[PDB]
Every structure is written in C-alpha cells, then in structure tokens.
Amino acid sequence: AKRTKKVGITGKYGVRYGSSLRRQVKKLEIQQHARYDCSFCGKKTVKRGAAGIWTCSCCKKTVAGGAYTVSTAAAATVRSTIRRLREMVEA
Amino acid sequence: NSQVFGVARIYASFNDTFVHVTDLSGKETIARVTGGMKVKADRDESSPYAAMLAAQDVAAKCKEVGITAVHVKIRATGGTRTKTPGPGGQAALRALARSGLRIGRIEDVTPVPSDSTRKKGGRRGRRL
C-alpha cells in the first residue's frame, strides 16, 4: 500500500500547476499540518490553524508562530540576540 | 627629562610610505606627509628617498607645533595583506634623526589576524 512515490500530500493537485510549484507547496503544507512539541505541557499536541498561531490540543496554550512552522528560524536567531544583549545590560 | 611628546605612526606600503605624527591619545594629528607628495612618479611613492624627504617637511612643523620628542610606531599593510614593510619605511625612521626630534620606545603595529578572511588573487595564484 505504497500509494504515491514522489507527490504524497500533493497528489490532491493531480497534474496541475507544475512540478516545482506543487513540490514547493508540499514542503510548507507538511510543515503547517505537522504536530509539534508543546514547550509547556511537553506533548506533541501543538497543531496549527490560522497561519501564525499555534495551540496545544491538551494544555490549551497558544503560541505566536511562523506561518507554516512554529519557529521562524530567523526569529530564534532573534531570541538569541535579545537574550544576549539583555545579559550584557543586566550583568 | 622635559621633552614634549608625540606619537609618530609610520606605515610603509610597497606602493607608498605613510608618515603620521599625532599626540599621545591618537585623536589630534600634528602633521602627516607621504612619499606621493614629494616626488612625481607613481613608481617612487614608496621610495626610500621619498620617505626620507617626508620626515624632513614634517619636522619643520614638529618643533614649530612644539613636539620636541616623539615615539615611533611602524606597520605594514597587514590583515590579509603583505605583512612585510615597504622600501621607504626604514629610510623614514632613520631620517627622523636628521630632524632633531628625540625618538623613543619603538614598537610594531602591523595588523596580524587570528586567521582572517580569504586572500586576493584566487587560488591558482597571480600568474605572470
């Protein structure tokens, strides 16, 4: 029961739109649909809806996220520089 | 002792020589003259006689501003660059004795990275 080979989730799109576009969608499509780790309750309950917001299906806490994934990579590289330049000012 | 003091920072490129005198904290400069002034070449901007003809015209204002004695600071281009002093740099330091300015406390400021950025010229080299 292997079903598709390449497309997977984007088999829904059939022959339409072109490979690269269809292919680029699958990436983010899988990101946004994935379940993530609650930094609070500690389960993989974090799901999306309404891009930018992410909640826990059990502990009911909602985190402002990236659009299609929970951590903007550039935004974690922010939290660092924020934490860094804070620890310089308070030390 | 007396000897009103200044800091004479000499930078010798293979293509030119910098002779620069300031006060102790490096802010206010006294006079700076280089080989590209005292000759018409583009070849001789680094000339040993150039950099010697430089310290000369410095010294007239050095005693005139009131810097009687001067430290000495020498560097090549450094960083990713040649690191080896130019031709006129040593014919400058000496020509500072033709002034009457009193030298002291020599030291070398050539910038020497901790293993820096990639070098110019591209691998297979500079080929001629």
């Binding site: - | 009103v4 003091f5 102790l24 904290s25 501003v65 009131g66």
Partner: protein, 216 residues
Amino acid sequence: VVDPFTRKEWFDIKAPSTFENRNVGKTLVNKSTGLKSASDALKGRVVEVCLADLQGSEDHSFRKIKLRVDEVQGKNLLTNFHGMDFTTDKLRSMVRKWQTLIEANVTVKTSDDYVLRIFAIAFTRKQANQVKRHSYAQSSHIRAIRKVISEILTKEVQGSTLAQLTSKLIPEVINKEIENATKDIFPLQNIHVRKVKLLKQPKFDVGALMALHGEG
C-alpha cells in the same frame, strides 16, 4: 592659508596614582570657544604608555597600558586604568617552535563593578638533563593547567577592585602564583598576563576618580 594650530590650547596629562611617574606629556585640544567647547573631545580620550615609563623601572619594558581619561579639571586632565597590552615584538619573541603554547582567559566582574576578561599566556620548557628535543605538553596537562590559570585569574580579579589589580599586575603577583600552582604538572616557561580588556564600567562618581588624582 589658515593653520588650525593658532587657537590650539595645550593640556597636561595626569596618570593614576597607583603608578609611580605621573607626568605623561602635553596633549593638545582645539579651543574652548562657543559652540562645542574643549572639554568635549578631551574627556573621553585613551592613552597608552609603557609600564617602564610609568613605574620608572625599565624591567616592565614590554607591557603597554591603556589609560582612559575620565575628568578634566582646571587645565589638568585626569585618567584611570583602561587596559593592558603586551606590545608585539616581545609577545612574538616568546613564541618559539618545538614547544606547547598555552592561552587562557576568563570573564570576571570586580567589586567596583568593572566586568573584566583578562588573558594569560604560558609555554613549556625542557628541564635540566632532558634529551627530548621538543617541549610539548600532553593535552590532559594543558587542560587543568589552563583551568587553574583561570581559577587563579578569577579569585585575584574577583576579590578586589581595579585599583588593586592596577598595582597587582605591576610586580606580576599573579604570574608567581601560576608558577607556584602549575609547578606540579609541567615546567612551563614564560607565564604572563598578556591582556586585560575593560568591558563594563560604572559612571563618573569622582570618588574613585579622586581616590586617584590630586596627589602625585
């Protein structure tokens, strides 16, 4: 045609009193007239003189010290301790092949609330009857050595302020505790304090600034 130097007001430079010779030389500044006076770019300046010139004993010849101007008082400017370099020639002259070069530092804040990270440099030597051509140290030596190099580098900068270490490094008190400590591991020629870098500073207060100046 113009000449900036007409109008140039000359100033006298006062070192800290944790040193010996306090007369550095005559710095100059542009005049104090209206629109941006001459206490503006005087105050913040940073000077570097040789420790042989400060203490008068030339035994210190290879140690440069950064001296930060803090206050300007009555045509007489006052400074404090900023940083300490090793110059170049000496530092490179201590680097010889066929031996281990050790480096260390640690960040430590002092009691006067100066956050500091101060560097140490060591080496290793043949001892006496050694026929072994090179001096190299085992890595599991260089580890705990550099550790206690910093553990000693901590407790000295930590317990006291900057005014004490300004006079602690002059005799090289710290270096001797490193040869006293690391005697038991490897021979270790040429222990020093190569650089101290002044990161965080308090502000003004002129009670540690005048615990310095006015006496010399």
